């Protein structure tokens, strides 16, 4: 709805940070906790899961290389 146009909009800077810090602070696979701890604009456990999975797999977070 909050776009009133085709193609889903991307995630917000603040939300990505919230999620990143959330997973780092409380671990992965606890979207409910993350969602409650950090103040997201309009997200759900499903959107958090989607975003993180897509990010770690395709938007290669990295910063954990052996060398």
Distance CA 34, CA 39 (A): 9
**Three-state DSSP class for residue 4:** coil
Give the domain 1-67 fold. Arc Repressor Mutant, subunit A (1.10.10)
Question: Which tokens in the block code for residue 64?
Answer: 């954990």
Method: NMR
Q: What does the domain layout of the chain look like in residue ranges?
A: 1-67
Distance CA 54, CA 67 (A): 24
Q: Which helix (H) or strand (E) holds 21?
A: helix 13-26
């Amino acid at each position: 709805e909050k776009h009133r146009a085709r193609k889903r909009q991307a995630w917000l800077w603040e939300e990505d940070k919230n999620l990143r810090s959330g997973v780092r602070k409380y671990g992965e696979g606890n979207w409910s906790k993350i969602l409650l701890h950090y103040k997201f604009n309009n997200r759900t456990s499903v959107m958090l899961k989607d975003r993180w999975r897509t990010m770690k797999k395709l938007k290669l977070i990295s910063s954990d290389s052996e060398d």
